[PDB]
Amino acid sequence: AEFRHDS
Amino acid sequence: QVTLKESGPGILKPSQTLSLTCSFSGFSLSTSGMGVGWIRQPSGKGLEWLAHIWWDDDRSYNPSLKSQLTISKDAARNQVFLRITSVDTADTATYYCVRRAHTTVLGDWFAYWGQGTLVTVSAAKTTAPSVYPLAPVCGGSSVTLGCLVKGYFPEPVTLTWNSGSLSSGVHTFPAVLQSGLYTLSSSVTVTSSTWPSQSITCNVAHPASSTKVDKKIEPRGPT
Amino acid sequence: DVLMTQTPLSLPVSLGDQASISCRSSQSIVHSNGNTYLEWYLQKPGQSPKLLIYKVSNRFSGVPDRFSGSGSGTDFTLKISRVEAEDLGVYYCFQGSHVPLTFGAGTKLELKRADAAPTVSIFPPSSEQLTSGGASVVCFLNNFYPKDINVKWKIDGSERQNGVLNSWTDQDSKDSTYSMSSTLTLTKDEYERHNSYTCEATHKTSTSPIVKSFNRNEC
């Protein structure tokens, strides 16, 4: 899965 | 100012559990958007990401190492921890603690790195090296001599030529493993009129075994 | 895993030259939020990596404008417009969009200098080692350039592939050359059962190997 980043 | 400082056990044996600590200042892991994590690097090799832990307890792991890794924190004490079970020799590496945020404002990148803590995973016992003179074959403006330092643990050894007075024309090679012990060599090159007429000695120390050896290089002969 | 592939892995350059390193990802590094978390780091010996470029093409604070990053999706490039000695070291691209976070293998930016043939010296086992039951034969291949080199041991004329340990210096701070040490370790029994010992160096400065040998029985 994606690593955590806002937006 | 942001600082991160890793600590670990220094040396542990294969199959044991590695317990790393990261202590930081200049920021707080209770801040929304903040995270702190671990990356490692075996000597002479690349960088491998291990894990990251977020302000809100969301933990992210390298899936290949999931069975061995546990990341945790203590936000109040400005610490993060990494536990690696069942270490083996391939876990020998420098372990870096790094900050990374998940918001643009707090810095979504690895800008801040600790200086790293070296962890050596070995079963080896303290072992003094043998020191051997490398004299040229029987028999042209220059001559090359050497010193072989074989079978020691832990690192390091120090090696000079003539107590440091012979500095030019010296190459000391990085240590390498032969099975579980290290071996190192050094060469010195001088004009042919210097040796054997003038004394050349390799000075080798292995502090961990209190070894200090001065080995004069003697020319080979017919007997 | 998103594999980050850097080309070349070693890049010799002269001071003042332009340098360019390719980084390709096995899938797109564009995150769902629209950002591309492609970073470049430089690591110097004895030091932690330092951030140079983030989001493909933004310079980190204090990074000189001779550094730039470009590209999109899966295809990225780091460029240095005029290489300085301070830029020498190992460059890593990195993707932060997908778990696991992954770095490229590292590209070593090294200094060009004139070709130099290795000086090769061979050393029989010492009296001291022989007394203890071992027999190491050492070969130094010193002060050569370029760095690519191979060593081959022969015993009684035939290649000996086993029992060899090698060590390589980093590029020399003073003369920009490289050196290598190779050791063939035998038992004293094996050393005493054969006679001709040969170290052969292969390097671009010669079409044939440099050969150093000795005969045990004559030592």
CA distance to partner chain B, nearest, from residue A1 (Å): 10
Nearest to B137 among C122, C142, C180 (CB): C122
H-assigned helices in B65-219: none
User: Hey, which CATH number is domain B1-123, 2.60.40.10, 3.40.190.10, 3.40.395.10, 3.40.50.10470?
Assistant: 2.60.40.10
Q: Judge if C34 and C61 occupy the same domain.
A: yes
User: Hey, which CATH number is domain B124-220, 3.40.140.10, 2.60.40.10, 1.25.50.10, 2.160.10.10?
Assistant: 2.60.40.10
> At how many Å resolution was this determined?
1.6
CB C13 within 8 A of CB C110: yes
Question: Which of B41, B102, A4, B210 minimizes the C-alpha distance to C32?
Answer: A4
CA distances from B164 to B133, B195, C82, C170 (A): 17, 17, 38, 21
CA distances from C84 to B204, C2, C111 (A): 37, 32, 10
| Contact partners, residue B73, CB within 8 Å, separation at least 6 | B29, B36, B53, B79, B80, B81
A 1-7: CB under 8 A from C:
1-3, 5-7
Ranges assigned E (strand) in B137-200: 142-152, 158-161, 170-172, 176-178, 181-191
Cα–Cα distance for residue pair C115/C69, rounded to 1 Å: 32
Query: What DSSP character marks residue C94?
Result: E
Q: Judge if C96 and C173 occupy the same domain.
A: no
Angle at B127 between CA B121 and CA B131, to 5 degrees: 125
Q: Which amino acid is at B76?
A: A
Question: Which of C129, C137, C181 minimizes the C-alpha distance to B151?
Answer: C129
Residue C106 lies in a domain: yes
The per-residue b/e assignment along B72-105, b for 16 or more CB within 10 angstroms, e otherwise, is ebebeebbbebebeebeeebbbbbbbbbbbbbee
Give me the number of domains chain C comprises: 2
Cα–Cα distance for residue pair C128/B220, rounded to 1 Å: 13
Q: Judge if C104 and C174 occupy the same domain.
A: no
Both structure tokens of C49: 């990596």
Nearest to C99 among A1, A6, A7 (CB): A1
Which structural domain range is residue C48 located in?
Answer: 1-113
Q: Judge if C80 and C163 occupy the same domain.
A: no
Angle at C149 between CA C148 and CA C153, to 5 degrees: 160
CA distance to partner chain A, nearest, from residue C2 (Å): 11
Cα–Cα distance for residue pair C60/C40, rounded to 1 Å: 10
CB B18 within 8 A of CB B7: no
Question: Which of C13, C20, C8 minimizes the C-alpha distance to C70?
Answer: C20
Structural biology method used:
X-ray
